[PDB]
Amino acid sequence: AVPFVEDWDLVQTLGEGAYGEVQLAVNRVTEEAVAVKIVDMKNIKKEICINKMLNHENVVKFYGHRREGNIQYLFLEYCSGGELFDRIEPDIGMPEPDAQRFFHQLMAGVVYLHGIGITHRDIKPENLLLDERDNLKISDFGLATVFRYNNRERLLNKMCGTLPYVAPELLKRREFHAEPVDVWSCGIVLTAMLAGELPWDQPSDSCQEYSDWKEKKTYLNPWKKIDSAPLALLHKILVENPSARITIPDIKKDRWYNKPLKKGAKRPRVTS
Ligand SMILES: NCCNC(=O)c1cncc(-c2cnc(Nc3cc(N4CCOCC4)ccn3)s2)c1
């Protein structure tokens, strides 16, 4: 009923790539911010379909979409804190309490997705967004797929993801379970947060850094920068055999996962 409420000004480029572009949109009337993903169809149907299923505090909300010929406009939750990628200091990482809080939020989002039978397939710091309160939100379902339907699991076979984050089974096996692949990429994200370095270009025996890890050479980088408690968790996540790999219910029982480290948000206080 209120005129101009449907008008959005595209004010800043959030991202640009092969997929198209992401723009920060500001409502003409309310000044509400949304991210608008603009896809040049000249995959998107699957992304919209998957987005319509999502409703979780650690998953970028989907508001709807509009088609204007060969161009689709996806109205998505705007995350003002940007990418988790930019919170990782190169060769350092970030404070262990911050990494633990982000890891708890990432596990919350992943448990949710797996619970509704969705696998993200490209978990990495570039796709993990932060809102105004530094809450982590999983974004970009362009590579996502349904791995469970009608309570029946579908084994995956497509090569999807980003090499440094990809699980070794995706490189060595024709078929693989979806869930351990997302668990592995979360372990690589945790490594990046705690060491500000990726451990290997890819999880192959031909890759020295990977062979060194399997040989337990933790006196080497990035492992030497990581405390024994999170390192013990990484030893359980970064397991080559996906059947032996720790599951999320067990990650929630891990000693480091449950270790008190982080104080709550900076609340206003006065003395006397
Ligand atoms: N993953 C690549 C394609 N993107 C998506 O699919 C995709 C899918 N769903 C949602 C989104 C976004 C939502 N909020 C965002 N905020 C944001 C803030 C930035 N900041 C840096 C510049 O100043 C402003 C804050 C920088 C970059 N992004 S991106 C993107």
Distance CA 158, CA 144 (A): 11
- Method by which the coordinates were obtained: X-ray
Nearest CA to ligand 1 atom 13: 78
Q: How far is CA 269 from CA 17, 159, 262, 263, 266, in A?
A: 45, 52, 18, 15, 9
Nearest CA to ligand 1 atom 15: 79
Both tokens of 206, joined, read 């031909």
Residues whose CB is less than 8 angstroms from the CB of residue 190 and which lie 6 or more positions away in sequence, other chains included: 99, 103, 230, 233, 234, 237
* Catalytic residue status for 212: no
Q: Is 63 annotated as a binding residue?
A: no
Q: Is 18 annotated as a binding residue?
A: yes
**DSSP string for residues in the chain:** --TTTT-EEEEEEEEEETTEEEEEEEETTT--EEEEEEEE---HHHHHHHHHH---TTB--EEEEEE-SSEEEEEEE--TTEEGGGGSBTTTB--HHHHHHHHHHHHHHHHHHHHTTEE-S--SGGGEEE-TT--EEE---SS-EE-EETTEE--B-S--S-GGGS-HHHHH-SSB-HHHHHHHHHHHHHHHHHHSS-S-SSS-TTSHHHHHHHTT-TTSTTGGGS-HHHHHHHHHHS-SSTTTSPPHHHHTT-TTTT---PPPP-------
Both tokens of 10, joined, read 């595209």
Distance CA 129, CA 209 (A): 28
Torsion of CA 155, 157, 158, 160, to 10 degrees: 70
Distance CA 272, CA 270 (A): 7
N- to C-terminal Cα separation, the chain: 52
Residues whose CB is less than 8 angstroms from the CB of residue 45 and which lie 6 or more positions away in sequence, other chains included: none
Pick the CATH number of 1-89 from 3.40.50.300, 3.90.920.10, 3.40.50.620, 3.30.200.20: 3.30.200.20
Fill in the amino acid letter for 211: S
CATH of domain 90-272: 1.10.510.10
Q: Which residues have CB under 6 Å of ligand 1?
A: 14-15, 22, 35, 37, 60, 76, 78-80, 82-83, 127, 129, 139-140
| Domain spans in the chain, listed from the N-terminal domain onward | 1-89, 90-272
Q: Catalytic: which of 40, 122, 182, 227? A: 122
